[PDB]
Design a protein around this ligand. Structure first.
Ligand SMILES: CC(C)S[C@@H]1O[C@H](CO)[C@H](O)[C@H](O)[C@H]1O
Ligand SMILES: [Mg+2]
Ligand code: NA
Ligand code: NA
Ligand code: NA
Lengths: 210, 211
Protein backbone atom coordinates (compact mmCIF):
# COMPACT_ATOMS: atom_id res chain seq x y z
CA UNK A 1 0.00 0.00 0.00
CA UNK A 2 1.25 3.44 -1.06
CA UNK A 3 0.08 6.59 0.68
CA UNK A 4 0.67 10.06 -0.77
CA UNK A 5 -0.17 13.27 1.09
CA UNK A 6 -0.45 16.00 -1.59
CA UNK A 7 -0.39 19.66 -0.52
CA UNK A 8 -2.15 22.22 -2.73
CA UNK A 9 0.12 25.04 -1.54
CA UNK A 10 3.84 24.97 -0.70
CA UNK A 11 6.91 27.23 -0.87
CA UNK A 12 7.08 25.81 -4.42
CA UNK A 13 3.87 27.72 -5.22
CA UNK A 14 5.86 30.98 -5.10
CA UNK A 15 7.69 29.78 -8.23
CA UNK A 16 4.50 28.51 -9.87
CA UNK A 17 2.61 31.73 -10.60
CA UNK A 18 1.81 30.99 -14.27
CA UNK A 19 -1.29 32.55 -15.86
CA UNK A 20 -3.49 29.45 -15.79
CA UNK A 21 -6.01 27.55 -13.65
CA UNK A 22 -4.52 26.77 -10.24
CA UNK A 23 -5.12 23.08 -9.56
CA UNK A 24 -3.56 20.24 -7.55
CA UNK A 25 -3.11 16.48 -7.30
CA UNK A 26 -1.30 13.56 -8.89
CA UNK A 27 -1.91 14.79 -12.43
CA UNK A 28 0.72 12.90 -14.44
CA UNK A 29 1.53 9.16 -14.67
CA UNK A 30 2.68 7.01 -11.77
CA UNK A 31 4.93 4.03 -12.50
CA UNK A 32 7.29 1.38 -11.10
CA UNK A 33 10.69 0.88 -12.67
CA UNK A 34 12.92 -2.14 -12.13
CA UNK A 35 16.65 -1.61 -12.71
CA UNK A 36 19.51 -4.02 -11.93
CA UNK A 37 22.00 -3.18 -9.14
CA UNK A 38 24.63 -2.62 -11.83
CA UNK A 39 22.81 -0.16 -14.06
CA UNK A 40 22.93 2.66 -16.59
CA UNK A 41 22.25 5.65 -14.35
CA UNK A 42 22.63 8.34 -17.05
CA UNK A 43 23.44 8.87 -20.74
CA UNK A 44 23.95 11.99 -22.93
CA UNK A 45 23.82 11.94 -26.73
CA UNK A 46 25.56 14.66 -28.79
CA UNK A 47 25.92 15.05 -32.57
CA UNK A 48 28.71 17.20 -34.08
CA UNK A 49 29.24 17.96 -37.77
CA UNK A 50 31.71 19.10 -40.41
CA UNK A 51 31.10 22.43 -42.24
CA UNK A 52 28.71 20.96 -44.84
CA UNK A 53 27.01 18.32 -42.61
CA UNK A 54 28.22 15.48 -44.87
CA UNK A 55 29.91 13.96 -41.79
CA UNK A 56 28.89 13.55 -38.15
CA UNK A 57 30.23 12.11 -34.94
CA UNK A 58 27.69 10.77 -32.48
CA UNK A 59 29.14 11.11 -29.00
CA UNK A 60 27.42 9.18 -26.17
CA UNK A 61 28.53 9.57 -22.55
CA UNK A 62 27.20 6.76 -20.35
CA UNK A 63 27.25 6.65 -16.54
CA UNK A 64 26.83 3.52 -14.38
CA UNK A 65 25.99 2.79 -10.75
CA UNK A 66 26.90 -0.38 -8.84
CA UNK A 67 30.19 -2.26 -8.52
CA UNK A 68 32.92 -1.33 -10.99
CA UNK A 69 34.32 -4.30 -12.89
CA UNK A 70 36.92 -4.96 -15.61
CA UNK A 71 34.53 -7.17 -17.60
CA UNK A 72 31.86 -4.42 -17.88
CA UNK A 73 31.18 -2.88 -21.30
CA UNK A 74 28.90 -0.38 -23.01
CA UNK A 75 27.85 -0.82 -26.61
CA UNK A 76 26.12 2.12 -28.26
CA UNK A 77 24.64 1.17 -31.61
CA UNK A 78 22.85 3.46 -34.04
CA UNK A 79 20.03 2.27 -36.27
CA UNK A 80 18.13 3.58 -39.28
CA UNK A 81 15.04 1.40 -39.39
CA UNK A 82 16.32 -2.18 -39.22
CA UNK A 83 19.77 -1.27 -40.58
CA UNK A 84 22.56 -0.82 -38.04
CA UNK A 85 24.61 2.14 -39.27
CA UNK A 86 27.35 2.36 -36.61
CA UNK A 87 28.39 0.76 -33.30
CA UNK A 88 30.99 1.34 -30.59
CA UNK A 89 32.05 -0.81 -27.63
CA UNK A 90 34.19 0.24 -24.65
CA UNK A 91 35.03 -0.69 -21.05
CA UNK A 92 34.28 1.85 -18.31
CA UNK A 93 36.89 4.44 -17.43
CA UNK A 94 36.81 7.96 -18.81
CA UNK A 95 39.81 10.02 -19.87
CA UNK A 96 41.81 11.92 -17.24
CA UNK A 97 39.85 14.99 -16.05
CA UNK A 98 42.05 16.58 -13.37
CA UNK A 99 44.84 15.77 -10.86
CA UNK A 100 42.77 13.00 -9.19
CA UNK A 101 42.14 11.13 -12.47
CA UNK A 102 38.87 10.65 -14.32
CA UNK A 103 35.47 9.03 -13.99
CA UNK A 104 35.91 5.26 -13.54
CA UNK A 105 32.10 4.95 -13.57
CA UNK A 106 31.72 6.63 -17.00
CA UNK A 107 32.55 5.89 -20.63
CA UNK A 108 32.21 7.97 -23.82
CA UNK A 109 31.46 6.22 -27.14
CA UNK A 110 32.16 7.99 -30.46
CA UNK A 111 30.45 6.79 -33.64
CA UNK A 112 31.19 8.05 -37.14
CA UNK A 113 28.20 8.70 -39.38
CA UNK A 114 28.77 9.47 -43.07
CA UNK A 115 26.06 11.50 -44.83
CA UNK A 116 23.68 11.56 -41.84
CA UNK A 117 20.00 12.17 -42.61
CA UNK A 118 19.38 15.46 -40.80
CA UNK A 119 16.51 16.20 -38.41
CA UNK A 120 14.34 19.28 -38.87
CA UNK A 121 10.68 20.26 -38.49
CA UNK A 122 10.51 19.92 -42.30
CA UNK A 123 11.85 16.35 -42.42
CA UNK A 124 12.07 14.75 -38.97
CA UNK A 125 14.69 12.10 -39.83
CA UNK A 126 15.36 10.01 -36.75
CA UNK A 127 17.81 7.29 -35.83
CA UNK A 128 17.55 4.92 -32.87
CA UNK A 129 20.40 4.79 -30.34
CA UNK A 130 20.53 1.65 -28.21
CA UNK A 131 22.72 1.76 -25.13
CA UNK A 132 23.69 -1.73 -23.98
CA UNK A 133 25.32 -2.38 -20.64
CA UNK A 134 26.85 -5.86 -20.85
CA UNK A 135 29.75 -8.13 -19.90
CA UNK A 136 32.83 -8.53 -22.12
CA UNK A 137 31.52 -11.80 -23.58
CA UNK A 138 28.10 -10.32 -24.32
CA UNK A 139 25.65 -11.09 -21.55
CA UNK A 140 23.14 -8.22 -21.50
CA UNK A 141 22.65 -6.57 -18.12
CA UNK A 142 20.23 -3.92 -19.46
CA UNK A 143 19.57 -1.64 -22.42
CA UNK A 144 18.22 1.89 -22.58
CA UNK A 145 17.41 3.74 -25.82
CA UNK A 146 16.33 7.05 -27.37
CA UNK A 147 15.38 8.58 -30.70
CA UNK A 148 18.30 10.55 -32.21
CA UNK A 149 17.92 13.50 -34.55
CA UNK A 150 21.11 14.68 -36.23
CA UNK A 151 20.95 18.46 -36.09
CA UNK A 152 23.09 21.42 -35.07
CA UNK A 153 21.62 24.50 -33.40
CA UNK A 154 23.86 27.57 -33.20
CA UNK A 155 23.79 31.35 -33.19
CA UNK A 156 26.24 32.89 -35.64
CA UNK A 157 26.60 36.48 -36.79
CA UNK A 158 23.32 37.35 -35.06
CA UNK A 159 21.33 34.52 -36.69
CA UNK A 160 19.80 31.40 -35.16
CA UNK A 161 20.83 28.53 -37.42
CA UNK A 162 19.55 24.97 -37.71
CA UNK A 163 21.85 22.77 -39.78
CA UNK A 164 23.54 25.96 -41.07
CA UNK A 165 20.32 27.68 -42.21
CA UNK A 166 18.48 30.62 -40.59
CA UNK A 167 15.21 29.55 -38.99
CA UNK A 168 11.93 31.35 -39.31
CA UNK A 169 9.96 30.32 -36.23
CA UNK A 170 6.26 29.82 -36.93
CA UNK A 171 5.55 29.23 -33.28
CA UNK A 172 2.81 28.97 -30.68
CA UNK A 173 2.77 28.80 -26.88
CA UNK A 174 0.85 25.75 -25.66
CA UNK A 175 -0.38 25.08 -22.13
CA UNK A 176 -1.34 21.57 -21.05
CA UNK A 177 -5.11 21.92 -20.88
CA UNK A 178 -8.18 19.72 -21.27
CA UNK A 179 -11.71 21.11 -20.68
CA UNK A 180 -12.87 17.90 -18.94
CA UNK A 181 -9.60 16.63 -17.41
CA UNK A 182 -7.90 19.88 -16.40
CA UNK A 183 -4.12 19.63 -16.58
CA UNK A 184 -3.98 15.88 -17.28
CA UNK A 185 -2.63 15.14 -20.77
CA UNK A 186 -3.30 12.09 -22.94
CA UNK A 187 -1.70 10.84 -26.17
CA UNK A 188 -4.84 11.52 -28.24
CA UNK A 189 -5.11 15.22 -27.25
CA UNK A 190 -1.35 15.69 -27.74
CA UNK A 191 -1.54 14.09 -31.22
CA UNK A 192 -4.64 16.15 -32.05
CA UNK A 193 -2.78 19.37 -31.13
CA UNK A 194 0.32 18.42 -33.19
CA UNK A 195 -1.68 17.53 -36.32
CA UNK A 196 -3.66 20.81 -36.09
CA UNK A 197 -0.46 22.82 -35.53
CA UNK A 198 1.41 21.36 -38.54
CA UNK A 199 -1.72 21.60 -40.68
CA UNK A 200 -1.84 25.33 -39.90
CA UNK A 201 1.79 25.91 -40.84
CA UNK A 202 3.27 25.93 -37.36
CA UNK A 203 6.79 24.49 -37.01
CA UNK A 204 7.49 25.37 -33.38
CA UNK A 205 6.07 25.16 -29.87
CA UNK A 206 7.02 26.80 -26.57
CA UNK A 207 6.28 24.77 -23.43
CA UNK A 208 4.65 27.67 -21.62
CA UNK A 209 5.68 27.68 -18.86
CA UNK A 210 7.02 24.38 -17.49
CA UNK B 1 37.41 70.16 -52.23
CA UNK B 2 35.75 73.58 -52.10
CA UNK B 3 37.04 77.11 -52.52
CA UNK B 4 39.17 77.64 -49.36
CA UNK B 5 36.95 80.41 -47.95
CA UNK B 6 34.07 77.93 -47.64
CA UNK B 7 35.75 76.13 -44.72
CA UNK B 8 36.59 79.43 -42.99
CA UNK B 9 32.92 80.39 -43.17
CA UNK B 10 31.76 76.96 -41.91
CA UNK B 11 34.31 77.19 -39.03
CA UNK B 12 32.93 80.60 -38.00
CA UNK B 13 29.21 80.22 -38.73
CA UNK B 14 28.95 76.63 -37.47
CA UNK B 15 28.26 73.87 -40.02
CA UNK B 16 29.56 70.28 -40.04
CA UNK B 17 31.46 69.52 -43.25
CA UNK B 18 32.14 66.40 -45.24
CA UNK B 19 35.26 67.24 -47.25
CA UNK B 20 35.40 65.08 -50.37
CA UNK B 21 38.21 64.12 -52.77
CA UNK B 22 37.85 65.24 -56.38
CA UNK B 23 37.34 61.67 -57.66
CA UNK B 24 34.33 60.49 -59.70
CA UNK B 25 34.41 57.85 -62.44
CA UNK B 26 30.65 57.35 -62.78
CA UNK B 27 30.67 56.70 -66.54
CA UNK B 28 33.16 53.81 -66.47
CA UNK B 29 31.89 50.28 -67.21
CA UNK B 30 31.92 48.81 -64.66
CA UNK B 31 32.12 51.82 -62.29
CA UNK B 32 35.32 50.64 -60.54
CA UNK B 33 37.28 49.99 -63.74
CA UNK B 34 39.82 52.73 -62.90
CA UNK B 35 39.60 52.66 -59.10
CA UNK B 36 40.47 48.95 -58.99
CA UNK B 37 43.42 49.56 -61.34
CA UNK B 38 46.84 50.12 -59.65
CA UNK B 39 47.95 52.28 -62.59
CA UNK B 40 45.40 54.88 -61.42
CA UNK B 41 46.40 54.72 -57.74
CA UNK B 42 49.00 57.52 -58.00
CA UNK B 43 46.44 59.90 -59.61
CA UNK B 44 43.71 59.07 -57.08
CA UNK B 45 46.16 59.18 -54.18
CA UNK B 46 47.09 62.83 -54.84
CA UNK B 47 43.41 63.81 -54.95
CA UNK B 48 43.00 62.42 -51.44
CA UNK B 49 46.35 63.25 -49.82
CA UNK B 50 46.56 66.85 -51.08
CA UNK B 51 43.00 67.48 -49.80
CA UNK B 52 43.92 66.21 -46.32
CA UNK B 53 47.14 68.26 -46.28
CA UNK B 54 45.14 71.37 -47.20
CA UNK B 55 42.09 71.09 -44.92
CA UNK B 56 43.05 69.04 -41.81
CA UNK B 57 43.20 72.06 -39.48
CA UNK B 58 39.58 73.08 -40.14
CA UNK B 59 37.28 72.22 -37.21
CA UNK B 60 34.20 72.35 -39.50
CA UNK B 61 35.52 69.32 -41.39
CA UNK B 62 34.37 66.33 -39.33
CA UNK B 63 34.36 63.54 -41.94
CA UNK B 64 36.65 62.80 -44.90
CA UNK B 65 35.21 61.30 -48.10
CA UNK B 66 37.03 59.28 -50.77
CA UNK B 67 34.95 60.82 -53.58
CA UNK B 68 31.77 59.87 -55.39
CA UNK B 69 30.33 57.14 -57.61
CA UNK B 70 33.53 55.37 -58.61
CA UNK B 71 32.50 51.83 -57.63
CA UNK B 72 34.69 50.13 -55.05
CA UNK B 73 38.28 49.37 -56.02
CA UNK B 74 41.39 48.31 -54.12
CA UNK B 75 42.62 51.88 -54.53
CA UNK B 76 39.77 53.00 -52.24
CA UNK B 77 40.85 50.53 -49.50
CA UNK B 78 44.45 51.75 -49.75
CA UNK B 79 43.49 55.45 -49.49
CA UNK B 80 40.97 54.70 -46.73
CA UNK B 81 43.81 53.24 -44.66
CA UNK B 82 46.10 56.18 -45.57
CA UNK B 83 43.68 58.75 -44.05
CA UNK B 84 42.97 56.55 -41.00
CA UNK B 85 46.70 56.35 -40.39
CA UNK B 86 47.45 60.07 -40.95
CA UNK B 87 44.35 61.60 -39.30
CA UNK B 88 42.66 59.49 -36.59
CA UNK B 89 40.56 62.53 -35.57
CA UNK B 90 37.95 62.10 -38.35
CA UNK B 91 35.87 59.19 -39.70
CA UNK B 92 36.22 58.32 -43.39
CA UNK B 93 33.18 57.50 -45.51
CA UNK B 94 32.63 56.39 -49.09
CA UNK B 95 29.42 55.23 -50.80
CA UNK B 96 30.74 53.45 -53.90
CA UNK B 97 30.30 49.70 -54.33
CA UNK B 98 27.22 49.36 -52.12
CA UNK B 99 27.56 51.96 -49.35
CA UNK B 100 28.83 49.53 -46.69
CA UNK B 101 32.22 48.37 -48.02
CA UNK B 102 35.50 47.97 -46.10
CA UNK B 103 36.38 51.50 -47.29
CA UNK B 104 33.79 53.27 -45.11
CA UNK B 105 33.32 53.93 -41.36
CA UNK B 106 29.70 55.03 -41.97
CA UNK B 107 26.97 53.25 -43.94
CA UNK B 108 26.31 56.06 -46.38
CA UNK B 109 23.84 55.04 -49.09
CA UNK B 110 22.32 57.34 -51.67
CA UNK B 111 18.51 57.26 -52.08
CA UNK B 112 17.96 54.19 -49.93
CA UNK B 113 14.30 54.36 -48.94
CA UNK B 114 12.93 54.28 -45.40
CA UNK B 115 10.87 51.08 -45.53
CA UNK B 116 11.22 49.81 -49.10
CA UNK B 117 14.10 47.52 -50.12
CA UNK B 118 15.59 47.88 -53.60
CA UNK B 119 17.58 44.67 -53.90
CA UNK B 120 19.76 45.42 -56.94
CA UNK B 121 22.27 42.64 -57.66
CA UNK B 122 25.75 43.23 -56.18
CA UNK B 123 24.85 46.74 -54.90
CA UNK B 124 21.46 46.49 -53.13
CA UNK B 125 19.80 49.58 -51.59
CA UNK B 126 18.17 48.18 -48.45
CA UNK B 127 15.55 49.98 -46.42
CA UNK B 128 17.69 52.11 -44.06
CA UNK B 129 15.98 50.57 -41.03
CA UNK B 130 16.70 47.08 -42.36
CA UNK B 131 20.29 47.96 -43.37
CA UNK B 132 21.36 48.77 -39.78
CA UNK B 133 20.48 45.33 -38.42
CA UNK B 134 21.90 43.17 -41.22
CA UNK B 135 23.80 40.24 -39.64
CA UNK B 136 27.17 41.50 -38.41
CA UNK B 137 26.40 45.18 -39.10
CA UNK B 138 27.31 47.68 -36.36
CA UNK B 139 28.08 51.00 -38.11
CA UNK B 140 26.04 54.25 -38.05
CA UNK B 141 24.00 55.07 -41.14
CA UNK B 142 23.97 58.56 -42.62
CA UNK B 143 22.74 58.94 -46.20
CA UNK B 144 25.31 60.78 -48.35
CA UNK B 145 22.40 61.66 -50.67
CA UNK B 146 18.64 61.43 -50.15
CA UNK B 147 15.35 63.18 -51.02
CA UNK B 148 16.25 64.15 -54.61
CA UNK B 149 14.73 67.65 -54.84
CA UNK B 150 14.26 67.78 -58.61
CA UNK B 151 11.37 70.08 -59.52
CA UNK B 152 8.17 69.45 -57.59
CA UNK B 153 9.67 67.01 -55.10
CA UNK B 154 10.50 66.13 -51.46
CA UNK B 155 7.46 63.85 -51.32
CA UNK B 156 7.87 61.56 -48.33
CA UNK B 157 10.45 63.78 -46.58
CA UNK B 158 8.74 63.42 -43.17
CA UNK B 159 9.08 59.62 -43.42
CA UNK B 160 12.89 60.00 -43.27
CA UNK B 161 12.74 62.33 -40.27
CA UNK B 162 10.40 60.05 -38.34
CA UNK B 163 12.86 57.16 -38.90
CA UNK B 164 15.91 59.29 -38.05
CA UNK B 165 14.33 60.27 -34.71
CA UNK B 166 13.15 56.76 -33.80
CA UNK B 167 16.42 54.90 -34.59
CA UNK B 168 19.57 55.86 -32.67
CA UNK B 169 21.91 54.54 -35.44
CA UNK B 170 20.00 56.41 -38.17
CA UNK B 171 21.85 59.69 -37.79
CA UNK B 172 20.37 61.58 -40.73
CA UNK B 173 21.69 62.51 -44.17
CA UNK B 174 22.48 65.08 -46.85
CA UNK B 175 19.61 66.20 -49.09
CA UNK B 176 20.34 66.26 -52.83
CA UNK B 177 20.82 69.10 -53.27
CA UNK B 178 21.11 72.78 -52.32
CA UNK B 179 20.93 74.85 -55.52
CA UNK B 180 19.62 74.32 -59.09
CA UNK B 181 22.47 74.23 -61.61
CA UNK B 182 20.63 76.41 -64.11
CA UNK B 183 22.51 78.92 -66.25
CA UNK B 184 21.41 82.34 -67.50
CA UNK B 185 20.78 82.89 -71.20
CA UNK B 186 19.30 86.01 -72.82
CA UNK B 187 16.52 86.48 -75.38
CA UNK B 188 16.66 88.98 -78.30
CA UNK B 189 15.54 91.81 -75.99
CA UNK B 190 18.25 90.99 -73.44
CA UNK B 191 15.81 89.41 -70.98
CA UNK B 192 17.40 86.63 -68.90
CA UNK B 193 16.07 83.08 -68.67
CA UNK B 194 17.13 79.93 -66.82
CA UNK B 195 18.72 77.32 -69.09
CA UNK B 196 19.51 73.65 -68.54
CA UNK B 197 21.20 70.75 -70.37
CA UNK B 198 20.97 71.03 -74.15
CA UNK B 199 20.36 74.81 -74.22
CA UNK B 200 23.91 75.56 -75.42
CA UNK B 201 23.94 73.13 -78.34
CA UNK B 202 25.61 70.67 -75.95
CA UNK B 203 24.85 67.10 -77.04
CA UNK B 204 24.54 64.45 -75.77
CA UNK B 205 23.04 66.08 -72.67
CA UNK B 206 20.88 65.20 -69.67
CA UNK B 207 18.40 68.07 -69.95
CA UNK B 208 16.82 69.25 -66.67
CA UNK B 209 18.68 66.74 -64.46
CA UNK B 210 21.12 69.55 -63.52
CA UNK B 211 18.35 71.19 -61.46
C1 LIG C 1 20.64 56.56 -62.22
C2 LIG C 1 21.22 57.94 -62.51
C3 LIG C 1 20.13 59.01 -62.74
S1 LIG C 1 22.43 58.39 -61.28
C4 LIG C 1 21.99 59.69 -60.16
O1 LIG C 1 21.84 60.90 -60.89
C5 LIG C 1 21.37 61.96 -60.05
C6 LIG C 1 20.85 63.03 -60.99
O2 LIG C 1 20.54 64.26 -60.32
C7 LIG C 1 22.50 62.35 -59.08
O3 LIG C 1 23.63 62.84 -59.81
C8 LIG C 1 22.94 61.14 -58.25
O4 LIG C 1 24.16 61.43 -57.53
C9 LIG C 1 23.10 59.86 -59.10
O5 LIG C 1 23.10 58.72 -58.25
MG1 LIG D 1 2.26 35.47 -15.97
NA1 NA E 1 18.78 58.76 -34.87
NA1 NA F 1 20.08 63.24 -73.94
NA1 NA G 1 21.69 66.18 -61.11
Amino acid sequence: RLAVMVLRWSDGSYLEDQDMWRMSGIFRDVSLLHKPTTQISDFHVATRFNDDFSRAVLEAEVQMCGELRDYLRVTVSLWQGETQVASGTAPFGGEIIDERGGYADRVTLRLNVENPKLWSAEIPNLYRAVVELHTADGTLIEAEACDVGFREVRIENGLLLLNGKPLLIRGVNRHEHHPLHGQVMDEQTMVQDILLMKQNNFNAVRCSHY
Amino acid sequence: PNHPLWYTLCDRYGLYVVDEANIETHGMVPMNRLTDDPRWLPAMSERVTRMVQRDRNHPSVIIWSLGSESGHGANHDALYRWIKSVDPSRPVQYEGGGADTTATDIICPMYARVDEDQPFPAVPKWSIKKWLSLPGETRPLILCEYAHAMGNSLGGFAKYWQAFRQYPRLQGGFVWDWVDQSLIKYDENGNPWSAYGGDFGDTPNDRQFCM
